[PDB]
Amino acid sequence: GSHSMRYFFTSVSRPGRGEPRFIAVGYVDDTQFVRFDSDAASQRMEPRAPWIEQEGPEYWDGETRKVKAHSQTHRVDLGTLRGYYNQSEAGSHTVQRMYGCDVGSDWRFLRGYHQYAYDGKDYIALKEDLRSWTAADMAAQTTKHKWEAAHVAEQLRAYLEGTCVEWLRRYLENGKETLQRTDAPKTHMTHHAVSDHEATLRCWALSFYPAEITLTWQRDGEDQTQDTELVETRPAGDGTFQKWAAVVVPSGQEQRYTCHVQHEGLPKPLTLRWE
């Protein structure tokens, strides 16, 4: 179906403890393929998916150089931001950056991103037109002017609409067996008596990919959103994902309840009921 590539950058200052921590990770959809850790011995971009290991030394040397440049830029940014907001030098702060592109089923460009956050809050973000910027406060305003004069948006757009999309396609092809797979969820239901008058019905979805999925409970066809416990979709660690929705059922009403599962790998939505 639809696909996307994303790079996540986190930079955390450590006052009096030297250079800031820098961590970069790349994703194709819900699969990480690369990473760089400033505190690692290698000082290189490393593969994190088997299908990227085929990339020669030129790819790794190149990516290593660019991620190092990314790193140095963020180290400076931490100082500039500490100035914008008149903050001391003893406090630890966080800068986060994310950029990437979305493509439809036809693998054609659909949407591009490039966003910054400071201490967990939106700082500056490229708008959907990839031509304008969003700045909430004065600090961000300054940055916006700077980036407007250096025509940053125009260059970022070239990457997001061109390079980003092109290489996203390349990764999809090179890693077809895993990146282009759709694993329908394995579903089952558990039943446990919490007391004499009640029991827990839990609907399971396992070993599915991608991560996007919908799990709901119904009682006689009526949604139970606020009476069902929904856990966050979670990684199994093997590249697949998990999720469950539980509902407390009064003993004797099992038949009234239905679990509904929607996922890319399912032709039609599944309906399950304890019986």
């Binding site: 790349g26 940014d77 500039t80 910054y116 500056i124 940055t143 390079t163 092109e166 290489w167």
Partner: peptide
């Protein structure tokens, strides 16, 4: 593939 253009400063 990382953005290859020199990222401008904040």
């Amino acid at each position: 593939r990382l953005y290859q253009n020199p990222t401008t400063y904040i």
